């Protein structure tokens, strides 16, 4: 039943600047209402930033990073399973 997946897949960095990243991912099987993208420094205990991207989009640009620090980038989809099932995220770590 690959039909019912709600988690995005193969989230990856396609382009980068010292302080800028272009990420992309593949949509899940379910219709995505909108995406929530989260990012913060991989070192613990300082806050994750968040913003929203439309459900039809498959990329997003992120600004204002520190050069040479790694960030944990997380994408999840709001969808029909969002009412009663947990957030189902995909995550990567990326440097510079």
């Amino acid at each position: 039943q690959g039909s019912v997946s709600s988690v995005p897949t193969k989230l990856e960095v396609v382009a980068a600047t010292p302080t800028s990243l272009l990420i992309s991912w593949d949509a899940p099987a379910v219709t995505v209402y909108f995406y929530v993208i989260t990012y913060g420094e991989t070192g613990g205990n300082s806050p994750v930033q968040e913003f929203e991207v439309p459900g039809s989009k498959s990329t997003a640009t992120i600004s204002g990073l520190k050069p040479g620090v790694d960030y944990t980038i997380t994408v999840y989809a709001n969808n029909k399973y969002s009412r009663w099932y947990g957030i189902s995220p995909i995550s990567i770590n990326y440097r510079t």
Binding site: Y33, F34, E52, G55, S56, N78, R83
Partner: protein
Amino acid sequence: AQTGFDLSTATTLFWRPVPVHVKQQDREDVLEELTFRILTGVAKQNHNLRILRIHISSDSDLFFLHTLEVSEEDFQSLKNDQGILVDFASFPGKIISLLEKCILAQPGDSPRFQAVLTIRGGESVFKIVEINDFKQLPHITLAFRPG
């Protein structure tokens, strides 16, 4: 206008394109993907008045915008005009699942769900209909406003 949407503590529910059959007065009919942004929030003078807001825009025309706001008070009148049987707490999920049906719709579907927007200057009527072997059947009808 009436409502008073806070907008600074709004919760986003839905933000994506939906195929809509647009019918305009002096233009040919168009099938285009319109962006729907669905938020809920509260009034700016009264945090206990819940409000549903729907904005329709396109990616191709930035100044194209049609809006709808339904307070929980407004919903009682609207619930009896259309024979709606859910409460206000569940109403946004029914709208979203109908929009989802029109995203998933295929030309050969029967029943086929279809979204329609008709425009008279300063007023527009949005409906999601189900086309079956016998009739076009409206599941919801909503009055929108420019801007």
